Amino acid sequence: ARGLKKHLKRLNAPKHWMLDKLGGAFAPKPSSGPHKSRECLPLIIILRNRLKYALTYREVISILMQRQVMVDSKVRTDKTYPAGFMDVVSIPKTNENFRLLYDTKGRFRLHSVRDEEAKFKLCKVRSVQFGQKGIPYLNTYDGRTIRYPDPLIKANDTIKLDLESNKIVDFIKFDVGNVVMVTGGRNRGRVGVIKNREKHKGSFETVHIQDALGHEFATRLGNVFTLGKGTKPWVSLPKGKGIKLSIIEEARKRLAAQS
Amino acid sequence: GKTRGMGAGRKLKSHRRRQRWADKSYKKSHLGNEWKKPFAGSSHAKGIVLEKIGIEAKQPNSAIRKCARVQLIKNGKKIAAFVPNDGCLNYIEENDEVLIAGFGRKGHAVGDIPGVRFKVVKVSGVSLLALFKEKKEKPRS
Amino acid sequence: AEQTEKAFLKQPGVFLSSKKTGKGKRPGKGGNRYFKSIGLGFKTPREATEGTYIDKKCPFTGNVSIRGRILAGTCHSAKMNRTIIVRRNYLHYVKKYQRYEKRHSNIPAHISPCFRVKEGDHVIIGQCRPLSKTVRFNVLKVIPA
RNA sequence: CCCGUCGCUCCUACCGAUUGAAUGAUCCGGUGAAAUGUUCGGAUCGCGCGAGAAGUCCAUUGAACCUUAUCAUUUAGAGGAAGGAGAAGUCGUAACAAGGUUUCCGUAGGUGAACCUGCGGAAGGAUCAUUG
RNA sequence: GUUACUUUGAAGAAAUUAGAGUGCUCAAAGCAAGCCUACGCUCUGUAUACAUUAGCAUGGGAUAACAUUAUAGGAU
RNA sequence: GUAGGAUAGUGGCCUACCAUGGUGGUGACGGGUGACGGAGAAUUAGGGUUCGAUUCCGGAGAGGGAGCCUGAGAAACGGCUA
RNA sequence: GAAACUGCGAAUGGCUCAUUAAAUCAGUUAUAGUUUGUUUGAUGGUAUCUACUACUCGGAUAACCGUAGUAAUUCUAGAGCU
Ligand SMILES: [K+]
Ligand SMILES: [K+]
Ligand SMILES: [K+]
Ligand SMILES: [K+]
Ligand SMILES: [K+]
Ligand SMILES: [K+]
Ligand SMILES: [K+]
Ligand SMILES: [K+]
Ligand SMILES: [K+]
Ligand SMILES: [K+]
Ligand SMILES: [K+]
Ligand SMILES: [K+]
Ligand SMILES: [Mg+2]
Ligand SMILES: [Mg+2]
Ligand SMILES: [Mg+2]
Ligand SMILES: [Mg+2]
Ligand SMILES: [Mg+2]
Ligand SMILES: [Mg+2]
Ligand SMILES: [Mg+2]
Ligand SMILES: [Mg+2]
Ligand SMILES: [Mg+2]
Ligand SMILES: [Mg+2]
Ligand SMILES: [Mg+2]
Ligand SMILES: [Mg+2]
Ligand SMILES: [Mg+2]
Ligand SMILES: [Mg+2]
Ligand SMILES: [Mg+2]
Ligand SMILES: [Mg+2]
Ligand SMILES: [Mg+2]
Ligand SMILES: [Mg+2]
């Protein structure tokens, strides 16, 4: 190519969007934004495919251009706006507040939240460094930059951010014994407590996580998001509480429900 | 005996590669000579009828097998093509346009006809089968 | 001593004609020779800390950082100026015959003057940015053998 | 039952004068559009200044062409010489029996053709055998 | 001293293949859809597996390969 | 290899000087391909064999070369210059 | 509100497989070796200093209008505005 690609073929869309194979030749290409294209959920999918408020692309645009949808307390009129992990989606007209979280199967789920819970969100810190004039600052994995951060905060920690004031109200250090959710890989959407951390010089760090039922799994450091201090998450989890159920037990539950 | 060393994979591969050329079928499809043959790797070829020829049948049979000398349009090569069915040579004329197919044995003579590897399928855009059964009529011009 | 070129060779950023003295100054400060540790558990040779050679491509005293792949091999050739050929020997699996064949790779690598290498000894090379047409690796350790 | 020359028809390639031909890619040397940079230049335009076209100078990239040579893929050719196939051709009878001179291998020579002969060799011999 | 080898883990686009669910009238398919007609509900579903070699991390130390041994210039 | 130039930047990418180096029967170099590569397709004891121009990913081209303006991005051709 | 100036886009998409045999390409790496319109989050303190508009600087040009050239082209020259 001679420059940036503006189209996304439907087969090339991320699988967790769950787009029909014969729905069309194209999928909504995520716009530039706080979240990466492969790790986002465009507002068009949320409003049309998931919530079914809009029956078409045109209806999605019509709904959004009325300034009726807010992301992180800010009105967004971009259909392909990348809304990702921990983001808050609010529709004041319908009195609906949603938080984007990964289900046990690794797909974004619109988790309904209370009004109080909709006033804050969690962020993961990438690094802390000095800006111009020697002013310290940190940036999160959702594109945010915060100046004069708490000196105790460091990379890979989780900060509680108040959307109304855009200030850090609390933070969690990345350490063993903290409940976390996996945001990538085959174990995406699972929730557990860190057991130990393996660090290799000049290589990715491995994190070992134990599920509430005792199941053990490991993942990379960049795929681990801390949800609270100790074993109690700071936000409400979706249905299933990040517990991955084997296909056999899922089938047993389905058959039991059938009768 | 065969070589069996665990570090002797290269020799086994090379020996098989060299010995594959002794296989006639492998050599035919890997020497790149199909493009110098009259059909040049095609199932069919069109040509112009030059002359009707009778070919004596091979022993122990005795017959005159009717064939046509055809020049292929795409490369100008001249071949002998058998004209099947009774009295079907009467539907062929000099300077006629004929479609030629293989004789079924992949470039080899068939039956008691010596040195003939092709047959006529169509004449003047009409299949010989239709002409034999009177389903169609040969175009006048 | 090492001024064998048409230009004066010196460590960049190391001021020499200072009115003060580098008594308690760190390496590279106060005119003291600059050196650094490359990490990954590798030890800085004692010949680079107290040497006088100037080599901008030296991992420990130059302007090249080590990142990427760390490879081991045997010194195949040491005829170039500050460059050696490292021969890496490995086995390639031949799937159809379930066997292996011998194979080798020649890897040009920069060798700092702090190392003494000879054709036939084991070396460890770290990856760095392109240094020449074919050189992308820096000698980090030598086993005399 | 069987071998070859010779005689007829057809088919396939091979050699070949023609200092053969075409195309593609590299090699030697030469010319070299256009553009870019540089030197000079100053139609002209605004307030002694600023901007500035045509043109010109030397370089860089370099198409295109010419010369030399080498590879790759095709292709014409008077004529020559091979092989094969084809119901009922001519001359012999070389191989099959000890095939009527056992056969055959290598080498050399010679005869219309099969073939003959010399030297050494093999049994795939027509002898597994003379302490007779 | 250096490797081969084996175990385990991460990560490893979709589509295609295998495969769970689902009466497009059946089927090839598709990713639908089901209860009841509640001004609704099922947080509806849209699983899971596979993936040579080479690379990364981990446990083992049998079978193998390369290097070394005594002019002590050896170990402490 | 040293010092420069150029580049968005590393690099014989280019220039000056210096050294004689670099690859190769573990097949270099040269030639052929009716050779774009892959995800994949056909057939299926197992091992294998054959195919992959074509809707997904990556690359290249716009009759053949070359040069270039605009621009964040092109050596663009439904842009320009030879 | 036509027209026109200004801004942006036209480097995406579609098509094809000619060239290309460690090359493209696959898996796996690196940029501490660079550029990146845009989106998202943060961040902008000294200009006149003796001229001395900042309650706001100056000169043009399109559309328009009217004199046209050429066989001819979103070929093209003057003139009057804003
Ligand atoms: K006959
Ligand atoms: K008969
Ligand atoms: K005889
Ligand atoms: K005999
Ligand atoms: K005679
Ligand atoms: K550079
Ligand atoms: K250099
Ligand atoms: K290619
Ligand atoms: K632009
Ligand atoms: K415009
Ligand atoms: K543009
Ligand atoms: K790759
Ligand atoms: Mg394109
Ligand atoms: Mg006889
Ligand atoms: Mg006789
Ligand atoms: Mg005899
Ligand atoms: Mg340089
Ligand atoms: Mg292909
Ligand atoms: Mg082709
Ligand atoms: Mg097509
Ligand atoms: Mg494509
Ligand atoms: Mg192009
Ligand atoms: Mg054309
Ligand atoms: Mg052209
Ligand atoms: Mg072009
Ligand atoms: Mg066109
Ligand atoms: Mg185009
Ligand atoms: Mg091709
Ligand atoms: Mg490579
Ligand atoms: Mg940017």
mmCIF file of all heavy atoms in Angstrom, chain F residues 18-29:
data_model
loop_
_atom_site.group_PDB
_atom_site.id
_atom_site.type_symbol
_atom_site.label_atom_id
_atom_site.label_comp_id
_atom_site.label_asym_id
_atom_site.label_seq_id
_atom_site.Cartn_x
_atom_site.Cartn_y
_atom_site.Cartn_z
ATOM 1 P P C F 18 45.317 4.710 0.467
ATOM 2 O OP1 C F 18 46.781 4.735 0.237
ATOM 3 O OP2 C F 18 44.408 4.315 -0.637
ATOM 4 O "O5'" C F 18 45.030 3.753 1.710
ATOM 5 C "C5'" C F 18 45.761 3.900 2.916
ATOM 6 C "C4'" C F 18 45.194 3.061 4.035
ATOM 7 O "O4'" C F 18 43.791 3.374 4.245
ATOM 8 C "C3'" C F 18 45.194 1.556 3.832
ATOM 9 O "O3'" C F 18 46.464 0.962 4.025
ATOM 10 C "C2'" C F 18 44.146 1.101 4.836
ATOM 11 O "O2'" C F 18 44.674 1.080 6.153
ATOM 12 C "C1'" C F 18 43.117 2.227 4.726
ATOM 13 N N1 C F 18 42.014 1.878 3.803
ATOM 14 C C2 C F 18 41.016 1.025 4.283
ATOM 15 O O2 C F 18 41.104 0.616 5.447
ATOM 16 N N3 C F 18 39.991 0.673 3.477
ATOM 17 C C4 C F 18 39.941 1.141 2.232
ATOM 18 N N4 C F 18 38.911 0.770 1.469
ATOM 19 C C5 C F 18 40.946 2.010 1.712
ATOM 20 C C6 C F 18 41.955 2.350 2.523
ATOM 21 P P A F 19 46.922 -0.277 3.110
ATOM 22 O OP1 A F 19 48.374 -0.490 3.322
ATOM 23 O OP2 A F 19 46.405 -0.057 1.737
ATOM 24 O "O5'" A F 19 46.148 -1.524 3.727
ATOM 25 C "C5'" A F 19 46.457 -1.996 5.030
ATOM 26 C "C4'" A F 19 45.493 -3.064 5.478
ATOM 27 O "O4'" A F 19 44.156 -2.513 5.578
ATOM 28 C "C3'" A F 19 45.327 -4.256 4.550
ATOM 29 O "O3'" A F 19 46.369 -5.207 4.687
ATOM 30 C "C2'" A F 19 43.958 -4.797 4.942
ATOM 31 O "O2'" A F 19 44.038 -5.604 6.108
ATOM 32 C "C1'" A F 19 43.204 -3.515 5.292
ATOM 33 N N9 A F 19 42.309 -3.039 4.218
ATOM 34 C C8 A F 19 42.435 -1.911 3.452
ATOM 35 N N7 A F 19 41.457 -1.737 2.599
ATOM 36 C C5 A F 19 40.622 -2.819 2.827
ATOM 37 C C6 A F 19 39.410 -3.221 2.242
ATOM 38 N N6 A F 19 38.789 -2.550 1.272
ATOM 39 N N1 A F 19 38.837 -4.352 2.701
ATOM 40 C C2 A F 19 39.448 -5.030 3.679
ATOM 41 N N3 A F 19 40.588 -4.757 4.302
ATOM 42 C C4 A F 19 41.130 -3.625 3.826
ATOM 43 P P U F 20 46.785 -6.130 3.442
ATOM 44 O OP1 U F 20 47.957 -6.942 3.848
ATOM 45 O OP2 U F 20 46.865 -5.270 2.235
ATOM 46 O "O5'" U F 20 45.546 -7.110 3.260
ATOM 47 C "C5'" U F 20 45.110 -7.941 4.330
ATOM 48 C "C4'" U F 20 43.842 -8.680 3.981
ATOM 49 O "O4'" U F 20 42.842 -7.732 3.512
ATOM 50 C "C3'" U F 20 43.991 -9.721 2.870
ATOM 51 O "O3'" U F 20 43.128 -10.832 3.115
ATOM 52 C "C2'" U F 20 43.507 -8.964 1.640
ATOM 53 O "O2'" U F 20 43.058 -9.781 0.580
ATOM 54 C "C1'" U F 20 42.382 -8.128 2.237
ATOM 55 N N1 U F 20 42.030 -6.933 1.452
ATOM 56 C C2 U F 20 40.783 -6.913 0.857
ATOM 57 O O2 U F 20 39.977 -7.815 0.959
ATOM 58 N N3 U F 20 40.495 -5.792 0.130
ATOM 59 C C4 U F 20 41.324 -4.706 -0.058
ATOM 60 O O4 U F 20 40.935 -3.760 -0.738
ATOM 61 C C5 U F 20 42.600 -4.797 0.586
ATOM 62 C C6 U F 20 42.901 -5.883 1.302
ATOM 63 P P G F 21 43.317 -11.745 4.422
ATOM 64 O OP1 G F 21 44.486 -11.250 5.190
ATOM 65 O OP2 G F 21 43.277 -13.164 3.994
ATOM 66 O "O5'" G F 21 42.007 -11.449 5.276
ATOM 67 C "C5'" G F 21 40.747 -11.960 4.872
ATOM 68 C "C4'" G F 21 39.703 -10.877 4.783
ATOM 69 O "O4'" G F 21 40.000 -10.001 3.662
ATOM 70 C "C3'" G F 21 38.286 -11.362 4.516
ATOM 71 O "O3'" G F 21 37.616 -11.782 5.693
ATOM 72 C "C2'" G F 21 37.641 -10.163 3.839
ATOM 73 O "O2'" G F 21 37.261 -9.178 4.788
ATOM 74 C "C1'" G F 21 38.806 -9.633 3.004
ATOM 75 N N9 G F 21 38.841 -10.224 1.653
ATOM 76 C C8 G F 21 39.951 -10.764 1.054
ATOM 77 N N7 G F 21 39.721 -11.225 -0.140
ATOM 78 C C5 G F 21 38.376 -10.975 -0.347
ATOM 79 C C6 G F 21 37.563 -11.256 -1.472
ATOM 80 O O6 G F 21 37.883 -11.798 -2.532
ATOM 81 N N1 G F 21 36.253 -10.839 -1.274
ATOM 82 C C2 G F 21 35.786 -10.225 -0.141
ATOM 83 N N2 G F 21 34.488 -9.900 -0.144
ATOM 84 N N3 G F 21 36.536 -9.955 0.914
ATOM 85 C C4 G F 21 37.813 -10.353 0.745
ATOM 86 P P G F 22 37.054 -13.283 5.815
ATOM 87 O OP1 G F 22 36.741 -13.540 7.240
ATOM 88 O OP2 G F 22 37.975 -14.193 5.094
ATOM 89 O "O5'" G F 22 35.683 -13.250 5.011
ATOM 90 C "C5'" G F 22 34.625 -12.388 5.399
ATOM 91 C "C4'" G F 22 33.546 -12.350 4.350
ATOM 92 O "O4'" G F 22 34.059 -11.718 3.148
ATOM 93 C "C3'" G F 22 33.043 -13.700 3.870
ATOM 94 O "O3'" G F 22 32.090 -14.282 4.738
ATOM 95 C "C2'" G F 22 32.498 -13.379 2.487
ATOM 96 O "O2'" G F 22 31.212 -12.782 2.569
ATOM 97 C "C1'" G F 22 33.503 -12.335 2.006
ATOM 98 N N9 G F 22 34.596 -12.930 1.214
ATOM 99 C C8 G F 22 35.930 -12.981 1.533
ATOM 100 N N7 G F 22 36.653 -13.563 0.617
ATOM 101 C C5 G F 22 35.742 -13.925 -0.363
ATOM 102 C C6 G F 22 35.932 -14.590 -1.601
ATOM 103 O O6 G F 22 36.977 -15.015 -2.102
ATOM 104 N N1 G F 22 34.732 -14.748 -2.280
ATOM 105 C C2 G F 22 33.506 -14.325 -1.834
ATOM 106 N N2 G F 22 32.450 -14.562 -2.618
ATOM 107 N N3 G F 22 33.318 -13.702 -0.685
ATOM 108 C C4 G F 22 34.470 -13.537 -0.009
ATOM 109 P P U F 23 32.127 -15.859 5.021
ATOM 110 O OP1 U F 23 31.221 -16.139 6.159
ATOM 111 O OP2 U F 23 33.547 -16.274 5.096
ATOM 112 O "O5'" U F 23 31.488 -16.499 3.710
ATOM 113 C "C5'" U F 23 30.154 -16.194 3.333
ATOM 114 C "C4'" U F 23 29.755 -16.898 2.060
ATOM 115 O "O4'" U F 23 30.429 -16.297 0.922
ATOM 116 C "C3'" U F 23 30.121 -18.369 1.956
ATOM 117 O "O3'" U F 23 29.256 -19.222 2.683
ATOM 118 C "C2'" U F 23 30.090 -18.598 0.453
ATOM 119 O "O2'" U F 23 28.758 -18.717 -0.021
ATOM 120 C "C1'" U F 23 30.688 -17.286 -0.054
ATOM 121 N N1 U F 23 32.151 -17.407 -0.246
ATOM 122 C C2 U F 23 32.577 -17.996 -1.415
ATOM 123 O O2 U F 23 31.811 -18.389 -2.274
ATOM 124 N N3 U F 23 33.932 -18.106 -1.554
ATOM 125 C C4 U F 23 34.888 -17.696 -0.649
ATOM 126 O O4 U F 23 36.077 -17.863 -0.919
ATOM 127 C C5 U F 23 34.371 -17.101 0.546
ATOM 128 C C6 U F 23 33.049 -16.982 0.703
ATOM 129 P P G F 24 29.834 -20.550 3.377
ATOM 130 O OP1 G F 24 28.763 -21.104 4.237
ATOM 131 O OP2 G F 24 31.158 -20.237 3.963
ATOM 132 O "O5'" G F 24 30.069 -21.551 2.162
ATOM 133 C "C5'" G F 24 29.006 -21.881 1.284
ATOM 134 C "C4'" G F 24 29.498 -22.494 -0.003
ATOM 135 O "O4'" G F 24 30.360 -21.564 -0.714
ATOM 136 C "C3'" G F 24 30.352 -23.744 0.120
ATOM 137 O "O3'" G F 24 29.613 -24.916 0.402
ATOM 138 C "C2'" G F 24 31.060 -23.774 -1.224
ATOM 139 O "O2'" G F 24 30.197 -24.242 -2.249
ATOM 140 C "C1'" G F 24 31.335 -22.286 -1.445
ATOM 141 N N9 G F 24 32.676 -21.923 -0.959
ATOM 142 C C8 G F 24 33.020 -21.214 0.165
ATOM 143 N N7 G F 24 34.309 -21.091 0.310
ATOM 144 C C5 G F 24 34.845 -21.767 -0.776
ATOM 145 C C6 G F 24 36.193 -21.978 -1.160
ATOM 146 O O6 G F 24 37.223 -21.595 -0.596
ATOM 147 N N1 G F 24 36.286 -22.720 -2.332
ATOM 148 C C2 G F 24 35.218 -23.196 -3.047
ATOM 149 N N2 G F 24 35.512 -23.889 -4.155
ATOM 150 N N3 G F 24 33.956 -23.007 -2.703
ATOM 151 C C4 G F 24 33.849 -22.289 -1.566
ATOM 152 P P G F 25 30.230 -26.032 1.377
ATOM 153 O OP1 G F 25 29.746 -25.762 2.750
ATOM 154 O OP2 G F 25 31.687 -26.118 1.129
ATOM 155 O "O5'" G F 25 29.572 -27.390 0.874
ATOM 156 C "C5'" G F 25 29.712 -27.813 -0.478
ATOM 157 C "C4'" G F 25 29.249 -29.234 -0.661
ATOM 158 O "O4'" G F 25 29.338 -29.590 -2.070
ATOM 159 C "C3'" G F 25 30.067 -30.283 0.091
ATOM 160 O "O3'" G F 25 29.215 -31.361 0.481
ATOM 161 C "C2'" G F 25 31.043 -30.762 -0.976
ATOM 162 O "O2'" G F 25 31.599 -32.038 -0.745
ATOM 163 C "C1'" G F 25 30.150 -30.738 -2.213
ATOM 164 N N9 G F 25 30.871 -30.667 -3.488
ATOM 165 C C8 G F 25 30.749 -31.568 -4.513
ATOM 166 N N7 G F 25 31.505 -31.294 -5.535
ATOM 167 C C5 G F 25 32.170 -30.138 -5.161
ATOM 168 C C6 G F 25 33.127 -29.376 -5.871
ATOM 169 O O6 G F 25 33.579 -29.575 -7.002
ATOM 170 N N1 G F 25 33.554 -28.279 -5.135
ATOM 171 C C2 G F 25 33.119 -27.960 -3.876
ATOM 172 N N2 G F 25 33.656 -26.857 -3.335
ATOM 173 N N3 G F 25 32.227 -28.663 -3.201
ATOM 174 C C4 G F 25 31.795 -29.736 -3.898
ATOM 175 P P U F 26 29.201 -31.897 1.995
ATOM 176 O OP1 U F 26 30.505 -31.603 2.632
ATOM 177 O OP2 U F 26 28.703 -33.292 1.962
ATOM 178 O "O5'" U F 26 28.097 -31.002 2.712
ATOM 179 C "C5'" U F 26 26.763 -30.946 2.219
ATOM 180 C "C4'" U F 26 25.977 -29.831 2.865
ATOM 181 O "O4'" U F 26 26.005 -29.999 4.309
ATOM 182 C "C3'" U F 26 26.506 -28.423 2.594
ATOM 183 O "O3'" U F 26 25.416 -27.504 2.527
ATOM 184 C "C2'" U F 26 27.343 -28.135 3.833
ATOM 185 O "O2'" U F 26 27.531 -26.765 4.113
ATOM 186 C "C1'" U F 26 26.524 -28.832 4.915
ATOM 187 N N1 U F 26 27.300 -29.228 6.098
ATOM 188 C C2 U F 26 27.180 -28.455 7.237
ATOM 189 O O2 U F 26 26.470 -27.472 7.301
ATOM 190 N N3 U F 26 27.931 -28.874 8.303
ATOM 191 C C4 U F 26 28.770 -29.965 8.346
ATOM 192 O O4 U F 26 29.379 -30.213 9.386
ATOM 193 C C5 U F 26 28.842 -30.718 7.132
ATOM 194 C C6 U F 26 28.121 -30.329 6.076
ATOM 195 P P G F 27 24.632 -27.277 1.146
ATOM 196 O OP1 G F 27 23.925 -25.977 1.225
ATOM 197 O OP2 G F 27 23.861 -28.508 0.849
ATOM 198 O "O5'" G F 27 25.793 -27.158 0.064
ATOM 199 C "C5'" G F 27 26.460 -25.923 -0.175
ATOM 200 C "C4'" G F 27 26.547 -25.628 -1.651
ATOM 201 O "O4'" G F 27 27.150 -26.773 -2.316
ATOM 202 C "C3'" G F 27 25.200 -25.397 -2.335
ATOM 203 O "O3'" G F 27 25.324 -24.427 -3.374
ATOM 204 C "C2'" G F 27 24.883 -26.761 -2.931
ATOM 205 O "O2'" G F 27 24.016 -26.733 -4.044
ATOM 206 C "C1'" G F 27 26.271 -27.270 -3.308
ATOM 207 N N9 G F 27 26.361 -28.732 -3.343
ATOM 208 C C8 G F 27 25.821 -29.606 -2.434
ATOM 209 N N7 G F 27 26.038 -30.857 -2.726
ATOM 210 C C5 G F 27 26.761 -30.808 -3.907
ATOM 211 C C6 G F 27 27.280 -31.861 -4.701
ATOM 212 O O6 G F 27 27.202 -33.078 -4.509
ATOM 213 N N1 G F 27 27.949 -31.376 -5.816
ATOM 214 C C2 G F 27 28.101 -30.049 -6.128
ATOM 215 N N2 G F 27 28.785 -29.794 -7.250
ATOM 216 N N3 G F 27 27.623 -29.058 -5.397
ATOM 217 C C4 G F 27 26.966 -29.507 -4.307
ATOM 218 P P A F 28 24.055 -23.533 -3.798
ATOM 219 O OP1 A F 28 22.969 -23.750 -2.814
ATOM 220 O OP2 A F 28 23.787 -23.766 -5.236
ATOM 221 O "O5'" A F 28 24.570 -22.036 -3.642
ATOM 222 C "C5'" A F 28 24.882 -21.495 -2.367
ATOM 223 C "C4'" A F 28 26.190 -20.750 -2.402
ATOM 224 O "O4'" A F 28 27.274 -21.695 -2.588
ATOM 225 C "C3'" A F 28 26.350 -19.760 -3.547
ATOM 226 O "O3'" A F 28 25.772 -18.498 -3.261
ATOM 227 C "C2'" A F 28 27.857 -19.703 -3.744
ATOM 228 O "O2'" A F 28 28.463 -18.823 -2.808
ATOM 229 C "C1'" A F 28 28.266 -21.139 -3.422
ATOM 230 N N9 A F 28 28.391 -21.987 -4.622
ATOM 231 C C8 A F 28 27.726 -23.159 -4.876
ATOM 232 N N7 A F 28 28.044 -23.713 -6.015
ATOM 233 C C5 A F 28 28.981 -22.848 -6.553
ATOM 234 C C6 A F 28 29.715 -22.875 -7.750
ATOM 235 N N6 A F 28 29.604 -23.836 -8.666
ATOM 236 N N1 A F 28 30.577 -21.863 -7.980
ATOM 237 C C2 A F 28 30.691 -20.896 -7.063
ATOM 238 N N3 A F 28 30.063 -20.764 -5.901
ATOM 239 C C4 A F 28 29.218 -21.785 -5.700
ATOM 240 P P C F 29 24.719 -17.831 -4.272
ATOM 241 O OP1 C F 29 24.412 -16.475 -3.762
ATOM 242 O OP2 C F 29 23.619 -18.794 -4.513
ATOM 243 O "O5'" C F 29 25.526 -17.675 -5.635
ATOM 244 C "C5'" C F 29 26.642 -16.804 -5.739
ATOM 245 C "C4'" C F 29 27.403 -17.054 -7.016
ATOM 246 O "O4'" C F 29 28.041 -18.357 -6.955
ATOM 247 C "C3'" C F 29 26.563 -17.111 -8.284
ATOM 248 O "O3'" C F 29 26.257 -15.834 -8.813
ATOM 249 C "C2'" C F 29 27.412 -17.971 -9.208
ATOM 250 O "O2'" C F 29 28.470 -17.219 -9.783
ATOM 251 C "C1'" C F 29 27.998 -18.979 -8.222
ATOM 252 N N1 C F 29 27.163 -20.195 -8.119
ATOM 253 C C2 C F 29 27.247 -21.167 -9.117
ATOM 254 O O2 C F 29 28.025 -20.991 -10.062
ATOM 255 N N3 C F 29 26.480 -22.278 -9.026
ATOM 256 C C4 C F 29 25.655 -22.432 -7.994
ATOM 257 N N4 C F 29 24.918 -23.539 -7.942
ATOM 258 C C5 C F 29 25.547 -21.456 -6.964
ATOM 259 C C6 C F 29 26.312 -20.364 -7.066
#
